[PDB]
Design a protein around this ligand. Structure first.
Ligand SMILES: Cc1cc(=O)[nH]c(N2CCN(c3ccc(F)cc3)CC2)n1
Ligand SMILES: [Zn+2]
Length: 206
């Protein structure tokens, strides 16, 4: 029972979601190989993802993690880029959205850097690119990102399935690229809510 409400760009909500998308762009060590070459996005549409069953699935698990961690759910707003975004907004996150070949295990991956999530919009390493031009740096086709409410709880810090014992998620602390932001991994689909569906294009630097 998913409903997508279009957010007006006049709305304070559109303005704060676009600002978290824009300000969290960074240069990638692959030179744009996976996500393309760009410094900003053309934000075409921001939509609120409304689903009573999934929101309840998430706040139920949130209350569990909170009570297991001195009433702190450790809730973040993170980006999620995946070829299975359209399936996530209707069925939620689960074991089919888990990244088997992940660095922090077979869990569901999230990023603080929007530009990081953009690397997985067309698949692992950007796949073959957009389905129309087979271009990983395509500047034409419309891309789609999720801005998710994530319950991290007790997160296992990793400097560089199931969660480490006595923990609720894993934090990928960046230990080489001094400008990278953290990456997070949850092992329960219930621990995340697909809050915002952002439609956009990467923009050719001038
Ligand atoms: C680091 C990071 C940030 C981000 O936004 N997204 C992701 N992924 C990881 C890989 N994914 C995946 C899911 C299910 C599969 F079958 C294969 C891949 C989805 C998106 N990673
Ligand atoms: Zn294209």
């Amino acid at each position: 029972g998913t409903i997508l409400i279009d957010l007006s760009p006049d709305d304070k909500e559109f303005q704060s979601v676009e600002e978290e998308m824009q300000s969290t762009v960074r240069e990638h060590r692959d030179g744009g190989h996976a996500g393309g070459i760009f410094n900003r996005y053309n934000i075409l549409k921001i939509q609120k993802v409304c689903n009573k069953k999934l929101w309840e699935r998430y706040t139920h698990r949130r209350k569990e993690v909170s009570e297991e961690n001195h009433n702190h759910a450790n809730e973040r707003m993170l980006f999620h880029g995946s070829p299975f975004v359209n399936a996530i907004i209707h069925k939620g996150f689960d074991e089919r959205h888990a990244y088997i070949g992940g660095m922090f295990g077979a869990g569901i991956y999230f990023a603080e850097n929007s530009s990081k999530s953009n690397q997985y919009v067309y698949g692992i390493g950007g796949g073959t690119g957009c389905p129309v031009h087979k271009d990983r740096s395509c500047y034409i086709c419309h891309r789609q990102l999720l801005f998710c409410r994530v319950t991290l709880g007790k997160s296992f810090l990793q400097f560089s399935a199931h969660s480490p014992p006595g923990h609720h998620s894993v934090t990928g602390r960046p230990s080489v690229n001094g400008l990278a932001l953290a990456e997070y991994v949850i092992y329960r689909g219930e621990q995340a809510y697909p809050e915002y569906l952002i439609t956009y294009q990467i923009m050719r630097p001038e």
